[PDB]
Amino acid sequence: SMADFRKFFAKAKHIVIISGAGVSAESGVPTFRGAGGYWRKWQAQDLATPLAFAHNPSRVWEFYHYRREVMGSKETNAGHRAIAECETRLGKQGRRVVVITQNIDELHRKAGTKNLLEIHGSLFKTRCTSCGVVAENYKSPICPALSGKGAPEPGTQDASIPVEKLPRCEEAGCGGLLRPHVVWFGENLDPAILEEVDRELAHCDLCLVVGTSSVVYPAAMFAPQVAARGVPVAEFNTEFRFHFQGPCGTTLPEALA
Numbered sequence: 001s002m003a004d005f006r007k008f009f010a011k012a013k014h015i016v017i018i019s020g021a022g023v024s025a026e027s028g029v030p031t032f033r034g035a036g037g038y039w040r041k042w043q044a045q046d047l048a049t050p051l052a053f054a055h056n057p058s059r060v061w062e063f064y065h066y067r068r069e070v071m072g073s074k075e076t077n078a079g080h081r082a083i084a085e086c087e088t089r090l091g092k093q094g095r096r097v098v099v100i101t102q103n104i105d106e107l108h109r110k111a112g113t114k115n116l117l118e119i120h121g122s123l124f125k126t127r128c129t130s131c132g133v134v135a136e137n138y139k140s141p142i143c144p145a146l147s148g149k150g151a152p153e154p155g156t157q158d159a160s161i162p163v164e165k166l167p168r169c170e171e172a173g174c175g176g177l178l179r180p181h182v183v184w185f186g187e188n189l190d191p192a193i194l195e196e197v198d199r200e201l202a203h204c205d206l207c208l209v210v211g212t213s214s215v216v217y218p219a220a221m222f223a224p225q226v227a228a229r230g231v232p233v234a235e236f237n238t239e240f241r242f243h244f245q246g247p248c249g250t251t252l253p254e255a256l257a
């Protein structure tokens, strides 16, 4: 019960919050998973791959430029804010709150989350395919050749941008082709991020799963090994161990008050 879960929440000195696509969808974010896993003639699973970027980097850039640009009109919801406010309060008490997420839209960052573990990278981060440098990039568009490009509708002509006119590395004497700093399909997670993650899960005394569940990716990598230690896990979704049904923007302000 919410009443018994708040008994744990008050005693909990290290809370791990696993945030799923649901936390992002509640803010009207095009989650390119399930029914909405489409951008024109293709599936998101067909565009987010090292082979797709190798054959057509311009098409993969048109798709990722679209995703960066849809965020302009998007705001952090009541769930994100409740999560950010919780970490601030408990922080002043010498207690820990950390957010583990595969959402690449930075709405936890805009909310005010500090202990944020983005296991799949960010839309607003680049990586040079040549020198390997990682950089923050919020520039709109990312490059002048992508001005007015990336429309989601099928049939839309391919921008057909030559590699030289695509996003390039601003490091002195590099000029290498940039790629978004996001984990693609068949790509491994950063071992540094997973080390940090496994460290969090090993030290926490309370674990929450929001906008996803322990039976679907990525919570299935983390929440069950937590439950196995006898640490309480509380699931929160639209569908000890707790379950709180409903939109996280409704249930989390109450739970994390």
Ligand SMILES: [Zn+2]
Pocket (backbone or CB within 6 Å): 128, 129, 130, 131, 132, 133, 169, 170, 171, 174, 175, 176
């Ligand atoms: Zn470079």
